[PDB]
Amino acid sequence: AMKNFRLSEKEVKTLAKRIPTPFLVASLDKVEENYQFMRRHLPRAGVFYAMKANPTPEILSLLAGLGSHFDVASAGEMEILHELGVDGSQMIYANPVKDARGLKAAADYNVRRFTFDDPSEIDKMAKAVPGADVLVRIAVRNNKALVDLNTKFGAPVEEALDLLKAAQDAGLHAMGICFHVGSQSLSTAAYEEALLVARRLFDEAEEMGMHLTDLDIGGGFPVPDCKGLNVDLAAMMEAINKQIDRLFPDTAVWTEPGRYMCGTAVNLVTSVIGTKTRGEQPWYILDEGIYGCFSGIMYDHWCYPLHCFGKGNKKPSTFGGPSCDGIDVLYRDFMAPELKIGDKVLVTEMGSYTSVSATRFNGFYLAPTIIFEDQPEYAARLTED
Amino acid sequence: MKNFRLSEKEVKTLAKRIPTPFLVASLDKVEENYQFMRRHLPRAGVFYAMKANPTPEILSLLAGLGSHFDVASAGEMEILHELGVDGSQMIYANPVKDARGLKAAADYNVRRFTFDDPSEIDKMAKAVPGADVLVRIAVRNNKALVDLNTKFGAPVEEALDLLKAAQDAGLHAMGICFHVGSQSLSTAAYEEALLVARRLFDEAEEMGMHLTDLDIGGGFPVPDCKGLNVDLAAMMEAINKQIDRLFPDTAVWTEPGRYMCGTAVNLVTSVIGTKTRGEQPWYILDEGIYGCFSGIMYDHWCYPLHCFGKGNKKPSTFGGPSCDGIDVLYRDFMAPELKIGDKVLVTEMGSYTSVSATRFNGFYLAPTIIFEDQPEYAARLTED
Ligand SMILES: Cc1ncc(COP(=O)(O)O)c(C=O)c1O
Ligand SMILES: Cc1ncc(COP(=O)(O)O)c(C=O)c1O
Ligand code: NA
Ligand code: NA
Ligand code: NA
Ligand code: NA
Structure with missing residues (x-):
C-alpha cells in the first residue's frame, strides 16, 4: 500500500544543479x-x-x-x-x-x-x-x-x-x-x-x-x-x-x-564522473562508492536499487566508485543505457545502514543528507497536489 | 630492521593516561x-x-x-x-x-x-x-x-x-x-x-x-x-x-x-566484556570492525594481536563493541584468561586501518597519539 520515497528525474536534475553530488535526500x-x-x-x-x-x-x-x-x-x-x-x-x-x-x-x-x-x-x-x-x-x-x-x-x-x-x-x-x-x-x-x-x-x-x-x-x-x-x-x-x-x-x-x-525515506544522487567505453561492457565511475553510502554492500550484505535515466537501448554495464581501490565496484552486468560524464543516477531505499558506515577513505567528504522538505522541489510537490 | 611495538609496560602507562581505544604512531x-x-x-x-x-x-x-x-x-x-x-x-x-x-x-x-x-x-x-x-x-x-x-x-x-x-x-x-x-x-x-x-x-x-x-x-x-x-x-x-x-x-x-x-603504528584496546559460558570464551573489545579493524573487511587483512599475562591459553573469540553480528574479529584464537579492563595490543596497524574507520553506532574514531610526544619515548631514549 505505502509508496517508497523516490525522486523524479526532473527533481534529480534541479537538485543536482543546486547541490554538488553526491548527496542523500531524506523525506521527513x-x-x-x-x-x-x-x-x-x-x-x-x-x-x-x-x-x-x-x-x-x-x-x-x-x-x-x-x-x-x-x-x-x-x-x-x-x-x-x-x-x-x-x-x-x-x-x-x-x-x-x-x-x-x-x-x-x-x-x-x-x-x-x-x-x-x-x-x-x-x-x-x-x-x-x-x-x-x-x-x-x-x-x-x-x-x-x-x-x-x-x-x-x-x-x-x-x-x-x-x-x-x-x-x-x-x-x-x-x-x-x-x-x-x-x-x-x-x-x-x-x-x-x-x-x-x-x-x-x-x-x-x-x-x-x-x-x-x-x-x-x-x-x-x-x-x-x-x-x-x-x-x-x-x-x-x-x-x-x-x-x-x-x-x-x-x-x-x-x-x-x-x-x-x-x-524507504532516503535517496542517493550521484554523478557519472568517468566512462570507459572500450570493449563490450561499458564502465561508469560514480562520485559515490563502497567507502561511502554503498558501504552497506560490504557490511550489510546489501544490493541497492539503481535507477539510470535515458530511453535508448541498454546493455550490460559495470559501475564503480571514485576511490583508487579495486574493491570499489558496485554493480556488474547491470542493464543500463548509454550514459555520459555529468549524467546523474539515482539510488532509492538508501536510508538505513548506508551513510552511518561511510568513511573519508581517500580523503573524500561524507555525502551530506539534504532535507527534502526544506527544498523548493517539495514545495512544488505540494502545489502540484 | 624491526617493527614498532609497544612493550606491555608502555601499554599500561599509556592506557592509565589515554582512554582506549587509541593508536600510537612512531615518527x-x-x-x-x-x-x-x-x-x-x-x-x-x-x-x-x-x-x-x-x-x-x-x-x-x-x-x-x-x-x-x-x-x-x-x-x-x-x-x-x-x-x-x-x-x-x-x-x-x-x-x-x-x-x-x-x-x-x-x-x-x-x-x-x-x-x-x-x-x-x-x-x-x-x-x-x-x-x-x-x-x-x-x-x-x-x-x-x-x-x-x-x-x-x-x-x-x-x-x-x-x-x-x-x-x-x-x-x-x-x-x-x-x-x-x-x-x-x-x-x-x-x-x-x-x-x-x-x-x-x-x-x-x-x-x-x-x-x-x-x-x-x-x-x-x-x-x-x-x-x-x-x-x-x-x-x-x-x-x-x-x-x-x-x-x-x-x-x-x-x-x-x-x-x-x-609497521609504525599500534592499536591499544581494552576488554570491555567477557562471555565465559562457552567451551570457548568471548572477549569484547572497545575497537572493532567498524573502526581500525575495518581492514578485515576492505583490505582482506589479519592483524597481529597480542594479549598479555599468564597461564594456560585456550581458543577464544574476540568481538568488537558494536551491536552488529558481523563485528567478530578473531575466532579460535589461543589466548590466556582475560578480564574486563585488560589491555590488548595490535601491531602493524598503520595502513588502511584508521582511514576506513567510521562512526557507526555513534562510536568516536580512535585517535592517533604521537609516540615521540609521550614520556614513554623519552624513557626509551634514557635507556639506550
Ligand atoms: C594511485 C595509487 N598510488 C599508490 C597506492 C599505494 O598502494 P600501496 O599502499 O599498496 O603502496 C595506491 C593504492 O590504492 C594507488 O591507488
Ligand atoms: C538493540 C538493537 N535495536 C534495534 C536494532 C535495529 O535493527 P533493524 O535495523 O533490523 O530494525 C538493532 C540492530 O542492530 C539492535 O542491535
Ligand atoms: Na566503510
Ligand atoms: Na528456561
Ligand atoms: Na507458560
Ligand atoms: Na568501515
Missing part, C-alpha cells in the same frame, strides 16, 4: 508515514527508534516530536540526542556490552534503562547507574535473518531468570525481557516464537516473586532491496501485534525498529 | 621506513600515497624529509595545503577525477596527473591547461592482494594514442605509470612492468614523443598476523637494478602507501 514526511504505519499496525509496541540505522538530526527531532523514544548504542548517540533536547528518560542504552564512556554518559543524562546478556555486565551497570531498570536479552531463533543477532548477543533462555535475579541482587531493577530476531527478518514466526518463550519466562519469574512489567521485541522489520520486499509489512506487523495482545495483555511492550523507519 | 619508524626506501631504491623518488595513512604529524615529517605526495581527492590536497605543502609536491593520481578535486588542483597549482581513459582528457585540459600527464597502463600480477589493474589502467596498445590525444588537447605528455597491486608478493610483476614500459618509451621515441618520467606505483608489502616472507631489501634492490638497466636517462618515481606507516 516519509519517515513520519513510516512511524504512523507502525503505530497503526503494531499499536501494542511502543517505539524506541534504533538511531544506529540513521541518526540524521532532523529525523531524530521529527521522531522526538512524534513521541518516539530512542535506542542508543554508545555515548556518541546519547550526546546527539542530548544536544537535540531529548531527556535520558526517553532512551534505552541497548548495547548489551557497554564501555566506560557510554556508562558515564548514561549517568550524566539520567539514562536508566539498559539491556544485558551476561553476568559480567551486571557490576558495571550497578556501579554506573544504581537502581537502573534492566531487561535481560535472550537468544532466539531465526532462519530468515540477513544479520544474525543471536550469536554475539543474547543469553541462553535457561540463564535469563538467573541473570535477572543476580542483577536484582546487585540493586538493579529486574524489569523484563528483550530479544532481537535479527536484521532484515523475512520471518514473522520468529517474532511469534520469541513471544511464547518470553511468556513462559514471565510466568516463571512471577513465581519467584520477580514481577516483570516490560517486554522489548527488538527490531528487524525489513526494507526492499534491488529485488523489492517479499514480505507484506502490514500483515507482519498485525501478526506480531495479535500475538502480543494474546500473550501480553497487561505488559508494557516495546519495539526497537532501526532499518524500517528511514530505509 | 621515528616512519622516518626509518622512508630512509630504508631511499637506501635500497635510490632511483625512485617518493610520492607518499597518503590514502594509506594521512596523520598530520606523519605528513609533516615526510614533507620535512623531502617526500612528495600522491593525492586521491580534493580532501587530501586540502590536508596537505593546510600543512604548508605546495602543489608542486603533489601528483593527483586518481585516474578518474571529480569536479572538486580538479578545482582544488587548479587552486593549488597541482599540475601532475595520471589518466587511463580518453574521457579523462578534456576534464584535465579544462581544469589545468598544459598539465603534465602520465598515462597509466594495466599490468599483470598474480601475487597481489588488491587488484589495481581491472578498474584502472589502459590497455598497453592504447597508451601512446592516449598520450597523443592528451597532447592534442594541449596537455604535456610526460610519461607512463603503473601500479602492480597492493600487497604485492611478486618482484617479477615489477620487472615485467618495467619491461613493458621500456618498450613503450622506445616506441614513443621513434614517434618523436620523448617521455621523461616513469612512475612505478606502490605495492610494497607489510607483515600481517603470519609475518612476511618477502625480503624488502631484496625486492627493492631488484627493482632499482632494473631501473638502472632500462631507465638510465629517465626520472623515476614510486608511490608507496602501505609500506611507509604500516
